[PDB]
Design a binder for this molecule. Structure first.
Ligand code: NA
Length: 157
């Protein structure tokens, strides 16, 4: 099945600037933004749609990886879609989790990040709370964790 829900966040950072870092500078930021994430390596492609990347991370005593795919990039509308693909770093009941993000200008000039998350399951029961939280968390590296690191960084203050 497919479990779809919406998430919204804010940033003090102007949307074009935030968007640019999300789509151009992820590889450099993410291992600095997330203590557990050791490295990101691009496996196939150049940063546009179809690109596959491997995140190497430590969770408990175990070195694991997830694969990330860039689904869509539309700079004119500040749209960035991506997914984490079925396996080592997702719960067993989950084939894929996609994040569909759009950045929009807040009234006061910061950003509102509008996200639709789609969790694809093997079965006919929506994921239990933890397995969905764990899957969502894998996707945070690519959006929320970057906005967080940037908001505390000298260049975006
Ligand atoms: Na790290």
């Amino acid at each position: 099945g497919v479990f779809t829900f919406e998430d919204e966040s804010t940033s003090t950072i102007a949307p074009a600037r935030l968007y640019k870092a999300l789509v151009k500078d992820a590889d450099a930021i993410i291992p600095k933004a997330v203590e557990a994430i050791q490295s990101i390596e691009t496996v196939e492609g150049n940063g546009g749609p179809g690109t596959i990347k491997k995140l190497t991370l430590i969770e408990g005593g175990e070195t694991k990886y997830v694969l990330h795919k860039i689904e869509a990039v539309d700079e004119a509308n500040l749209r960035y879609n991506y997914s984490i693909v079925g396996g080592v770093g997702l719960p067993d009941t989950i084939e894929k989790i996609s994040f569909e993000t759009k950045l929009v200008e807040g009234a006061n000039g910061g950003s509102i990040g509008k996200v639709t998350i789609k969790i694809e399951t093997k079965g006919d029961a929506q994921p239990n709370e933890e397995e969905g939280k764990a899957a969502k968390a894998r996707g945070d590296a690519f959006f929320k964790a970057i906005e967080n690191y940037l908001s505390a960084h000298p260049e975006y203050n």
